[PDB]
C-alpha cells in the first residue's frame, strides 16, 4: 500500500526511502542528465540538488524520489529554490506511464527566471492545464520558507507559510505517486522559463519534507 505519514530531515542519503535518479535524461524539455553525484546533503542537514557542467553546453541535474508511493494527505516542504533564467526547482507528486499508471501529478515549481513567484499545477490522466502563478511577497531563493499542498478527493489547496494561496476543485487526481524534488534546465521552452544561459553550478536546497495521510 501507499506509504504512511512521515518526516524527512535530509540528514543523509537513505537508499531505503529515497532514490537518486542517475544515468539518463527525461528528454524533451529537460536539457540535462540526472546524476546521483548531483544529489548531496550538507553538513547542516539540507538536501542540496545541483545543476552542474563538465562539458560544453552539457548539463547534469538532479532528482530525488521517494521509493514509496503516497496518496491523499498534506504535503509540506521547507525549501530554497535556485535563481537563474531558464531553470526549475520543484517539489511534486508524480506517477505515469514509466511507472505503469496513468499520468497523475501535483506540482510546485519555482521558475528560476523569477523566484518572487511560484507555479502550481496538476495533471489527471495526463490532462493538465491547471497552471496558476502566485506572487509570493518575497524572493524564495533568498531563504527557506514552507510550501504545501493538501491533496483531497474534491480539492487541492496550496499554502505558503500556512497561508492559503490557491484552491483547485476540478478533476483532482487520485492515483498515488512518488514524492519528488528536482532541479533542471529547460530547452525549447524559452517563453515559459526564459532561455538557460549555462550558469553553473546552481543549487536548490530542501530542509525537510513532511507528509500527513488522511
Ligand atoms: O523505472 C522505470 C523506467 O523509467 C525511467 O525514468 C522515468 C521515471 O521513472 C519517471 O518518473 C519520469 O517521469 C517524468 C516525466 O516524464 C515528466 O513529464 C515529469 O515532469 C514533471 C512535470 O510534469 C511537472 O510539471 O514538474 C516537474 C518538476 O519540474 C516535472 O519533473 O517529470 C517526471 C519525473 O522526472 O521519466 C523518466 C524517464 O522516462 C528510467 O529512465 C528508465 O531507465 C526506467 O527503467
Ligand atoms: Ca533538515
Ligand atoms: Zn516565510
Ligand atoms: Zn486561485
Swiss-Prot record:
Keywords of the record: Disulfide bond, Glycosidase, Hydrolase, Signal
Catalytic function, reaction form: Hydrolysis of (1->4)-beta-D-glucosidic linkages in beta-D-glucans containing (1->3)- and (1->4)-bonds
Active site: 105, 109
One GO MF term attached to the UniProt entry: licheninase activity
Protein name, as recorded: Beta-glucanase
Domain GH16 residue range list: 17-214
Keyword field contains Transmembrane: no
Domain of life: Bacteria
Enzyme Commission number, as recorded: 3.2.1.73
Organism of this sequence: Paenibacillus macerans
Additional remark text: Beta-glucanases of Bacillus have a substrate range similar to lichenase of germinating barley.
Biological processes, Gene Ontology terms: carbohydrate metabolic process
SS bond list: 32-61
Coiled coil regions in record: none
The family this protein is said to belong to: Belongs to the glycosyl hydrolase 16 family.
Amino acid at each position: 500500500q501507499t506509504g504512511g505519514s512521515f518526516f524527512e530531515p535530509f540528514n543523509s542519503y537513505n537508499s531505503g526511502t529515497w532514490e537518486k535518479a542517475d544515468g539518463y535524461s527525461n528528454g524533451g524539455v529537460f536539457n540535462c542528465t540526472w546524476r546521483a553525484n548531483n544529489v548531496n546533503f550538507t553538513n547542516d542537514g539540507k538536501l542540496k540538488l545541483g545543476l552542474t557542467s563538465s562539458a560544453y553546453n552539457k548539463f547534469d541535474c538532479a532528482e530525488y524520489r521517494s521509493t514509496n508511493i503516497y496518496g491523499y494527505g498534506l504535503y509540506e516542504v521547507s525549501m530554497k529554490p535556485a535563481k537563474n533564467t531558464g531553470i526549475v526547482s520543484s517539489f511534486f507528486t508524480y506517477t505515469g506511464p514509466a511507472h505503469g499508471t496513468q499520468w497523475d501529478q501535483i506540482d510546485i515549481q519555482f521558475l528560476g527566471k523569477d523566484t518572487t513567484k511560484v507555479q502550481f499545477n496538476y495533471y489527471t490522466n495526463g490532462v493538465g492545464g491547471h497552471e496558476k502563478v502566485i506572487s509570493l511577497g518575497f524572493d524564495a531563493s533568498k531563504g527557506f520558507h514552507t510550501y504545501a499542498f493538501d491533496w483531497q478527493p474534491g480539492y487541492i489547496k496550496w499554502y505558503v507559510d500556512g497561508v492559503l494561496k490557491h484552491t483547485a476543485t476540478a478533476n483532482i487526481p487520485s492515483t498515488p505517486g512518488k514524492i519528488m524534488m528536482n532541479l533542471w534546465n529547460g530547452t525549447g521552452v524559452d517563453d515559459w522559463l526564459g532561455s538557460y544561459n549555462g550558469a553553473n553550478p546552481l543549487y536548490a536546497e530542501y530542509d525537510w519534507v513532511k507528509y500527513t495521510s488522511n
